[PDB]
């Protein structure tokens, strides 16, 4: 409706008998392949991303936002637990870091 791509903002310009809209939009570019999974199996529990998607570069698993590649460590703060690992089709095994663990470790 407001240009090709993900619309950010627009500018109006007067024209003789008309209006010209300058649509400023965000277009994704330089995409890269990653290996993906619906959920992460850890401690017999299934972890799902709160807002992002699980990606793998070949050896390590990360969670990133869907529209830009920004890999982050899979923790309990960006994932939520629902059910065990027996129901979700295609769940893979990976560790889930806990931020609270070094605090009581030290």
């Amino acid at each position: 409706f407001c240009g090709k791509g993900y619309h950010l903002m627009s500018f109006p310009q007067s024209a003789p008998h008309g209006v010209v809209f300058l649509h400023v939009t965000y277009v994704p570019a330089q995409e890269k392949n990653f290996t993906t999974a619906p959920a992460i199996c850890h401690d017999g529990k299934a972890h799902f991303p709160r807002e992002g998607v699980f990606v793998s570069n070949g050896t390590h698993w990360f969670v990133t936002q869907r529209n830009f590649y920004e890999p982050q460590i899979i923790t309990t703060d960006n994932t939520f637990v629902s059910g065990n690992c027996d129901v979700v089709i295609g769940i893979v095994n990976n560790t889930v870091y806990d931020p609270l663990q070094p605090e009581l470790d030290s």
Partner: protein
């Protein structure tokens, strides 16, 4: 072919030119309408040869290789169910190319989600695309993943009911 009639008709001026120009405008407007509706992608996408979409069946909407017209069963049913100075101009886009455009749109929305509409087509598995759509309407991803078989069965049943309803209603 009456020359006397044309000689008398010339007294009325450029009425014929106005009528021809109006009809020409309507005729180009129809092609513009078809261009706006169907030609919304500049890449012709195709589905993978293996139709592994996590249990989701799209046979009724994807093009049939067996048919010479390369139409879907639903599209074939739709085409079957529709039955002095005058000329009919052919449409600029044939039915085959419109079917090809719909095939490209279907392949893009199945294999790439909504990414192809906003830029380059980024591949995503279909049970992840469905989870994203579930998140769009405010339902968590886990609900989709846990009940993926039931949702796939319901979707296939609904598509079959759509084909039956179209085939059974005049």
């Amino acid at each position: 072919d009456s020359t006397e009639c044309s000689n008398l008709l010339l007294q009325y001026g450029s009425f014929c030119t106005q009528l021809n120009r109006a009809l020409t405008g309507i005729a180009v407007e129809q092609d513009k309408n078809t261009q706006e509706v169907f030609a919304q992608v500049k890449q012709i996408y195709k589905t993978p040869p293996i139709k592994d979409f996590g249990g989701f069946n799209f046979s009724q909407i994807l093009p049939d290789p067996s048919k010479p017209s390369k139409r879907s069963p639903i599209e074939d049913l739709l085409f079957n169910k529709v039955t002095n100075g005058l000329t009919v101009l052919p449409p600029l886009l044939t039915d085959e190319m419109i079917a090809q455009y719909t095939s490209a749109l279907l392949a893009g929305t199945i294999t790439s989600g909504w990414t192809f509409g906003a830029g380059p087509a980024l591949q995503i598995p279909f049970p992840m695309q469905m989870a994203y759509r579930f998140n769009g309407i405010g339902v968590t991803q886990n609900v989709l993943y846990e009940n993926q078989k039931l949702i796939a069965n319901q979707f296939n049943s609904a598509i079959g009911k759509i084909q039956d309803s179209l085939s059974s209603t005049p």
